[PDB]
Amino acid sequence: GSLFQLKRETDDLEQWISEKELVASSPEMGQDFDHVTLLRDKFRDFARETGAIGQERVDNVNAFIERLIDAGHSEAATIAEWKDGLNEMWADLLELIDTRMQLLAASYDLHRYFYTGAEILGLIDEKHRELPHRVHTAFERELHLLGVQVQQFQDVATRLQTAYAGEKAEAIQNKEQEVSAAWQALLDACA
Numbered sequence: 001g002s003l004f005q006l007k008r009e010t011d012d013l014e015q016w017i018s019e020k021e022l023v024a025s026s027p028e029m030g031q032d033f034d035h036v037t038l039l040r041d042k043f044r045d046f047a048r049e050t051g052a053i054g055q056e057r058v059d060n061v062n063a064f065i066e067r068l069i070d071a072g073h074s075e076a077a078t079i080a081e082w083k084d085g086l087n088e089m090w091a092d093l094l095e096l097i098d099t100r101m102q103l104l105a106a107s108y109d110l111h112r113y114f115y116t117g118a119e120i121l122g123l124i125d126e127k128h129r130e131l132p133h134r135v136h137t138a139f140e141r142e143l144h145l146l147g148v149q150v151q152q153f154q155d156v157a158t159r160l161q162t163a164y165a166g167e168k169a170e171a172i173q174n175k176e177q178e179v180s181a182a183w184q185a186l187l188d189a190c191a
Contacts, residue, residue, distance in 0.1 A: 024096035029107035033115045040104045117175045124182045
């Protein structure tokens, strides 16, 4: 009710926001596919809960300050400033969250990419070892799917490379060339 309580309420909330910003600012993007999977899922929960709880609190402060200003409270100037600072911190936090969410998604896709690469390297391999029938048609369709999946892998490699340079980009490209060479040798193998 009182202005002192409003101030305190505003102060506690801004303090709460500052803590959330610390979490939303984490640089940890994960070092393997499991790790990034965990970070990504954890962050989604964090963003959702933080957003919902935070927005209600900000709204309530905004509503009460706005009513007081509307009613011509003599301290409208002081409380409007409180409102402005609060809204600026909240917006900073939301931007931090959006950013981290996107970066975690990029890291997810990158680790997923290398994870798939290995999967594919093994799969072509398991299909090269078999050097031949009645199950020819199972080999036919199966093999073709790879053509499409290796094609898909190449497509991912193409997209990811526009997101990175230097060593990361090089890593992405090396893995793609390694898969394309495995595939190419398989094809050549099967006459």
